[PDB]
Amino acid sequence: ESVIEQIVKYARKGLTPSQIGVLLRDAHGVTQARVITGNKIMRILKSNGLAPEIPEDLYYLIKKAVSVRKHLERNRKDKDAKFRLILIESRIHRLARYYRTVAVLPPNWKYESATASALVN
Amino acid sequence: MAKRTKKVGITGKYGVRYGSSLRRQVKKLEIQQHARYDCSFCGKKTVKRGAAGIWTCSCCKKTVAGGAYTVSTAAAATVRSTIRRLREMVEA
Amino acid sequence: RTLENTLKAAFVAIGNTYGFLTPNLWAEQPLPVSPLDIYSDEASAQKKRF
Amino acid sequence: MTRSSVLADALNAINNAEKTGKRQVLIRPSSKVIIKFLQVMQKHGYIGEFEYIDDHRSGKIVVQLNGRLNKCGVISPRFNVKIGDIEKWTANLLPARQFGYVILTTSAGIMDHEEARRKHVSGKILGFVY
Amino acid sequence: MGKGKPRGLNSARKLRVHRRNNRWAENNYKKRLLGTAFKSSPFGGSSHAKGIVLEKLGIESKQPNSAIRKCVRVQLIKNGKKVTAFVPNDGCLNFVD
RNA sequence: UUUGGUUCUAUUUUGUUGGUUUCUAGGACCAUCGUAAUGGGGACGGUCGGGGGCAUCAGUAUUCAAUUGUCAGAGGUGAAAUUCUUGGAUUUAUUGAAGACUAACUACUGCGAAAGCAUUUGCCAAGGACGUUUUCAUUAAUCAAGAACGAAAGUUAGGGGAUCGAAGAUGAUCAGAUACCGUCGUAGUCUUAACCAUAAACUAUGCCGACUAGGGAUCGGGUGGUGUUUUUUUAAUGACCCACUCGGCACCUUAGAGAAAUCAAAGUCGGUUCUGGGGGGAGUAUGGUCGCAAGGCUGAAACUUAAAGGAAUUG
RNA sequence: GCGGUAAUUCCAGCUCCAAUAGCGUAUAUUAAAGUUGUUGCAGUUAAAAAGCUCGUAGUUGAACUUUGGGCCCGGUUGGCCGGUCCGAUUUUUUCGUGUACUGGAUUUCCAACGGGG
RNA sequence: GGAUAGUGGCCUACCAUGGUUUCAACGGGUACGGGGAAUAAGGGUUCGAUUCCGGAGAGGGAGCCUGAGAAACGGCUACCA
């Protein structure tokens, strides 16, 4: 039903893997790729496509947390007065643990990386 | 850690006495002098204290001025920003 | 107990706890003792008019 | 957490509120539960608006119930994905005496207490119909 | 409902068991701070008089007695009048007022 | 799964054991042939703010200072005095350095997990909103122990130190004041470094989820309808006429509950944890852990009492 | 809480009576006391919401099953006697005694079952 | 390996350094454990005992003969009370 409506609107299977496929190989951004086009076409992808193989995604969540952490770590080293911000460092790093428990259970190498992937990347 | 409980750092030298406050200061400056510091130039965690106020990089061999105990302080960093603020405005 | 006899009920073991005195207990009691309204009678409703 | 408890309480409060009907989201154990009660005729029917390919699933429940009062005097959740009561076949505590039934979820399918004795049974009580 | 927990499983339900034990207000296994015992016979040789309470008045005649199960406390004498001699051994009930 | 091979198993036809070799099922090794290997949070675009840290910058004090000018008071309160005061004050004008705070603005107001946070202004970087239907497609939800932050005031090193300001100094009160009241005054207030782990940390309402009444508009965005102000005249908005949605807010305000007073949940009966004990003894003893210490956490007994308490009434 | 002089509570005997070959009193224990709450209770002001958070060992399980089957269902298989319950009856009676019957959680092994977690 | 009627760090050589415990181990205190006893409508609390059953003793403790069987109240050895 939901998938069928978009099937009439778009154009057709085979073509849709190729259109999406380019943007992803360029550099990640599953959400981005997806807002381009020709949306009526892109709309079908969850509804029909399994979801592609990709670098990043499970890693993205951790990657961003570490990205943010380093910047805040300078602001904790300088002046101590930072009472609000510090908890945020504690929230983000930790939001990565919180995701890390379920995300570890289907695949291999998420277990080794995810522990390590605080304060490295 | 060590076989230590709290944290001596230096303290064992003293033996027993000296007191919490006195030994704490003497711990802080020297243990932070010892702490691996990145050289500005290479970026390797080279810097060691050659002497009081003398800092040297093991890799590059550039030697630099700084605090006696620590490579750097807050104070020195404040001075550098204000001169730069003055300098910027004059230049435009 | 006296209240039960007059109600024209002979035997009911009614576990009233949580309070000593008396006007509040007597005040509580007409209220289960007037609205009955729960099953079989509920089925019996259908029929109307004055 | 669940949705199941919300269903029993929303009907009982509504009977008191005096209303045309109910709408709520259904959920998976919650749709399975409902049907049994109707069969004993506490409720005329229910229909889920959009049974197929939909995010939530929402159930419009046809009430039995006003005009004058109702049918389902009290639906009060004892367990209903709430709290972890247990019943044995032999150990049957229940309120009401008789006028009312108990719903047990069992290995076989659902049913009333009285039918459940004829099979034998046990499970966990969902709620008490008085 | 129920009780707070669902009785769901996997090493739960254990928490409430701890609460019952901490919590029991009165005196525990028996009491023998001082005391009990159906006759505990103290031989006493102090006869004295103590006061009573704040809102009344009166002055009871009492006799203090030293117990076999070592303790000296004030004991009340029941009945009107009394005489009590050599020690003697007078057996006490140990009721609470 | 069908169909053949290659290795293992393999009574055997042989009294017998024996030496020597396949194929059939099963297992193994496979080729042929013939079907699957599968699905709250984030992401992008975004907006507010008083989210935090640093810098910049303003003014408005008073003190201090420099200077004016000029007499006999000023200061302060119920009343006074202490104080200040002819060596020229104070009040007054202007200018500088210092100097703490952000009046007016700031509102039933907004934001941070909370504690809290308010000059404008810049720099780095977070977070909740919406709107998307992109990803995990229910991924989730709470949690003793663990760990993090945690006002103020204490504490400690070092800089600054204006009014203020315990303690403490004189004065008045007054029977007594170490009191309120007045003057004076130090650590403190403040800054960077490091500790404290507590408050009437309050929304006296732990936190997560479902339903269950409306009503006035407040802020953010989004769907806008509509035109106007308002700009400019293709055109789109900051506010607005005028609805709707989403999240918080709070009041106004339900009736089933709430002792109650009240609440709209503290309602109808949830997920989960901590924790309660009649009051005084007691958030105390003792031991442990932690802390520089203050003290904080953890945590009662002999004993004593016929009450403590809440709310509502009538004096 | 009675006794500050005409005491309904002392002290003496009449009377009234609960109970009655027993009776209360003390101690121990339990009910009531939903006052250890599972059934059966509180945390705005009653003792009591942890200041708040980040997470876990451990509570729970998001739109109609299908395999397996531990928790599930459905039928059979053990618990001494004594005591407890139901009756004969037996000792002049009777409790005792006495016979016979009826029930027993739990666990074992076993047909069969598939909502849920 | 030895031992014993027979399990076996029960005991003992050598090699391994282990194994348990936030689901409570180790440790401390408690005015036999089960079958059962009274409560109370049920639920649970309480009680665990003299009797039945199994366990442990004989003033305290260790060892040993005899005998099928004893680590023995009515056996010894023998220190101590």
Swiss-Prot record, chain B:
Gene Ontology molecular function terms on file: structural constituent of ribosome; zinc ion binding
GO cellular component, one term: cytosolic large ribosomal subunit
Highest taxon above the source species: Eukaryota
Location of the protein in the cell: Cytoplasm
Zinc finger (C4-type): 39-60
SUPFAM superfamilies cross-referenced by the UniProt entry: Zn-binding ribosomal proteins (SSF57829)
Keyword Phosphoprotein applies: yes
Alphabetized UniProt keyword annotations: Cytoplasm, Metal-binding, Phosphoprotein, Ribonucleoprotein, Ribosomal protein, Zinc, Zinc-finger
PTM annotation (Phosphoserine): residues: S40
InterPro entries: Ribosomal_eL37/eL43 (IPR011331), Ribosomal_eL43 (IPR002674), Ribosomal_protein_eL43 (IPR050522), Ribosomal_zn-bd (IPR011332)
Note: Present with 44600 molecules/cell in log phase SD medium. There are 2 genes for eL43 in yeast.
Family in the record: Belongs to the eukaryotic ribosomal protein eL43 family.
Alphabetized PANTHER family for the sequence: 60S RIBOSOMAL PROTEIN L37A, LARGE RIBOSOMAL SUBUNIT PROTEIN EL43
Subunit organization: Component of the large ribosomal subunit (LSU). Mature yeast ribosomes consist of a small (40S) and a large (60S) subunit. The 40S small subunit contains 1 molecule of ribosomal RNA (18S rRNA) and 33 different proteins (encoded by 57 genes). The large 60S subunit contains 3 rRNA molecules (25S, 5.8S and 5S rRNA) and 46 different proteins (encoded by 81 genes).
Record's protein name: Large ribosomal subunit protein eL43A
Organism listed in the record: Saccharomyces cerevisiae (strain ATCC 204508 / S288c)
Gene: RPL43A
UniProtKB/Swiss-Prot annotation, chain C:
Post-translational modification note: N-terminally acetylated by acetyltransferase NatA.
Residue intervals passing through the bilayer: none
Subcellular location(s) of the protein: Cytoplasm; Nucleus, Nucleolus
Lineage top rank: taxon: Eukaryota
Entry function: Component of the ribosome, a large ribonucleoprotein complex responsible for the synthesis of proteins in the cell. The small ribosomal subunit (SSU) binds messenger RNAs (mRNAs) and translates the encoded message by selecting cognate aminoacyl-transfer RNA (tRNA) molecules. The large subunit (LSU) contains the ribosomal catalytic site termed the peptidyl transferase center (PTC), which catalyzes the formation of peptide bonds, thereby polymerizing the amino acids delivered by tRNAs into a polypeptide chain.
UniProt family annotation: Belongs to the universal ribosomal protein uS5 family.
Quaternary structure and partners: Component of the small ribosomal subunit (SSU). Mature yeast ribosomes consist of a small (40S) and a large (60S) subunit. The 40S small subunit contains 1 molecule of ribosomal RNA (18S rRNA) and 33 different proteins (encoded by 57 genes). The large 60S subunit contains 3 rRNA molecules (25S, 5.8S and 5S rRNA) and 46 different proteins (encoded by 81 genes). Interacts with snoRNA U3. Interacts with MPP10. Component of the ribosomal small subunit (SSU) processome composed of at least 40 protein subunits and snoRNA U3.
Name the record gives this protein: Small ribosomal subunit protein uS5
Range of the intact protein held here: 205 to 254 of 254
Swiss-Prot record, chain D:
Pfam family, one: Ribosomal_S8
One term under GO cellular component: cytosolic small ribosomal subunit
Database matches in SUPFAM superfamilies: Ribosomal protein S8
Keyword annotations of the record: Cytoplasm, Ribonucleoprotein, Ribosomal protein
UniProt-recorded Gene Ontology molecular function terms: structural constituent of ribosome
InterPro entries xref list: Ribosomal_uS8 (IPR000630), Ribosomal_uS8_CS (IPR047863), Ribosomal_uS8_sf (IPR035987)
UniProt-annotated location(s): Cytoplasm
Highest taxon, organism lineage: Eukaryota
One BP term from GO: cytoplasmic translation
Note from the entry: Present with 40400 molecules/cell in log phase SD medium.
Assembly and binders: Component of the small ribosomal subunit (SSU). Mature yeast ribosomes consist of a small (40S) and a large (60S) subunit. The 40S small subunit contains 1 molecule of ribosomal RNA (18S rRNA) and 33 different proteins (encoded by 57 genes). The large 60S subunit contains 3 rRNA molecules (25S, 5.8S and 5S rRNA) and 46 different proteins (encoded by 81 genes).
Protein family according to the UniProt entry: Belongs to the universal ribosomal protein uS8 family.
Name of the featured protein: Small ribosomal subunit protein uS8A
Organism from which the protein derives: Saccharomyces cerevisiae (strain ATCC 204508 / S288c) (Baker's yeast)
Gene encoding the protein: RPS22A
Swiss-Prot record, chain E:
Protein's name according to its UniProt entry: Small ribosomal subunit protein uS12A
GO molecular function list: structural constituent of ribosome
Free-text function comment from the UniProt entry: Component of the ribosome, a large ribonucleoprotein complex responsible for the synthesis of proteins in the cell. The small ribosomal subunit (SSU) binds messenger RNAs (mRNAs) and translates the encoded message by selecting cognate aminoacyl-transfer RNA (tRNA) molecules. The large subunit (LSU) contains the ribosomal catalytic site termed the peptidyl transferase center (PTC), which catalyzes the formation of peptide bonds, thereby polymerizing the amino acids delivered by tRNAs into a polypeptide chain.
Cellular compartment(s): Cytoplasm
Lineage, uppermost ranks: Eukaryota, Fungi, Dikarya, Ascomycota, Saccharomycotina
Transmembrane stretches, start-end: none
Family assignment from sequence similarity: Belongs to the universal ribosomal protein uS12 family.
Keyword vocabulary terms for this entry: Cytoplasm, Hydroxylation, Isopeptide bond, Ribonucleoprotein, Ribosomal protein, Ubl conjugation
Covalent cross-link (Glycyl lysine isopeptide (Lys-Gly) (interchain with G-Cter in ubiquitin)), residues: K56
Gene: RPS23A
Main location: cytoplasm
Residue list for modification 3,4-dihydroxyproline: P64
Assembly behavior: Component of the small ribosomal subunit (SSU). Mature yeast ribosomes consist of a small (40S) and a large (60S) subunit. The 40S small subunit contains 1 molecule of ribosomal RNA (18S rRNA) and 33 different proteins (encoded by 57 genes). The large 60S subunit contains 3 rRNA molecules (25S, 5.8S and 5S rRNA) and 46 different proteins (encoded by 81 genes).
Keyword Protease: no
Gene Ontology cellular-component terms listed: cytosol; cytosolic small ribosomal subunit; ribosome
